Amino acid sequence: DSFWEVGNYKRTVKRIDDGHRLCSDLMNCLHERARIEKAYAQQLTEWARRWRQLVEKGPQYGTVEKAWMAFMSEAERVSELHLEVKASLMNDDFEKIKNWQKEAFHKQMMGGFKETKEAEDGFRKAQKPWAKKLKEVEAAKKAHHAACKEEKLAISREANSKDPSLNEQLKKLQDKIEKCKQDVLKTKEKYEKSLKELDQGTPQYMENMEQVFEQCQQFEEKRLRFFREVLLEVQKHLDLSNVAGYKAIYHDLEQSIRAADAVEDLRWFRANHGPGMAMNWPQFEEW
């Protein structure tokens, strides 16, 4: 249940497979955002294309037609602006994480990552002496839970011994007890002797596990620091107020709307479609 138990390092070795996994989960996350931005872009271009044709063809004209059109232009700047978020998310961040994942993790010909197997190996190897001593100890204690039982049972047999049927039979009982009692004694010493060695062994074993562990942390710290550095970059690319000309799109929009002059427009109609027009007052044609 705890890290020091044999093989309970399985977790810190898994963190490295998780390490790779997360480089993809993050790429996918960005990748999907990218499509969202380009979709909105696409929609905006479409809208402006649609409405450019409709305003040209329709009956709105003049400086109020200009103001209307202004709006399909701002859609076109916004479209370009979100389109290059896709561009930044994709060309840069995604590829940064992809290249990092190539340089940090390495698939091997018959398995997983070199990294994973290396941590998995240094762990096995720093745990090996001490796990050996452990099996030694457990076997010994079991051989001491065995002698104990048999001795106790020979002793019960003496209880059965106080049967009026016989009595070579008792002597055997006493001798059996003596040896069993003695054998309990030896197995005892063996066991506690092996337990001692395990304790000394343990300070040394403890050193080797931490050596291995602290370079698992190290590698992991690299991935964490990268996530940090890169997410700070991602957020710049998302921020459109980080763009110089964003503000200008709106300033230009405003300017175009302001220009629309109702009167300039009214004077254009009078002269081109109204009373302001040239007329050939009827004349007398001979012939």
Q: Does 176 bind a copy of itself (CB under 8 A)?
A: no
Q: Closest distance between a copy of itself and the C-beta of residue 104, in Å?
A: 14
The site string for a copy of itself over 240-279 (x = CB under 8 A, - otherwise) reads xxx---xx-xx--xx--xx-x-xx-xx--xx--xxxxxxx
Whole-number Å distance between alpha carbons of 45 and 38: 10
Q: Closest distance between Ca ion and the C-beta of residue 60, in Å?
A: 5
Phi, psi of 48 (to 5 degrees): -65, -35
Q: Does 228 bind a copy of itself (CB under 8 A)?
A: yes
Residue 125 partner contact from Ca ion, a copy of itself, none using kind-dependent CB cut-offs of 5 to 8 Å: none
Scanning residues 69 to 88, which ones bind a copy of itself (CB under 8 A)? 70-71, 74-75
Q: Which helix (DSSP H) or strand (DSSP E) does residue 163 occupy?
A: none
Q: Closest distance between a copy of itself and the C-beta of residue 223, in Å?
A: 9
C-alpha distances in angstroms, 93 versus 16, 19, 97? 22, 18, 6
What 3-state class would DSSP assign to 242?
helix
For the beta carbon of residue 136, count every other beta carbon within 10 angstroms.
16
For the beta carbon of residue 2, count every other beta carbon within 10 angstroms.
5
Residue 173 partner contact from Ca ion, a copy of itself, none using kind-dependent CB cut-offs of 5 to 8 Å: none
Q: Does 155 bind a copy of itself (CB under 8 A)?
A: no
Q: Closest distance between Ca ion and the C-beta of residue 59, in Å?
A: 6
The site string for Ca ion over 31-60 (x = CB under 5 A, - otherwise) reads ---------------------------x--
Whole-number Å distance between alpha carbons of 9 and 87: 42
Q: Which helix (DSSP H) or strand (DSSP E) does residue 44 occupy?
A: helix 10-57
Cα-Cα end-to-end distance for the chain: 120
Residue 273 partner contact from Ca ion, a copy of itself, none using kind-dependent CB cut-offs of 5 to 8 Å: a copy of itself
Candidates 2, 16, 216; CA nearest to 107 is 16
Q: Does 21 bind a copy of itself (CB under 8 A)?
A: yes
Residues of this chain that interact with Ca ion (CB under 5 A) are 58, 61
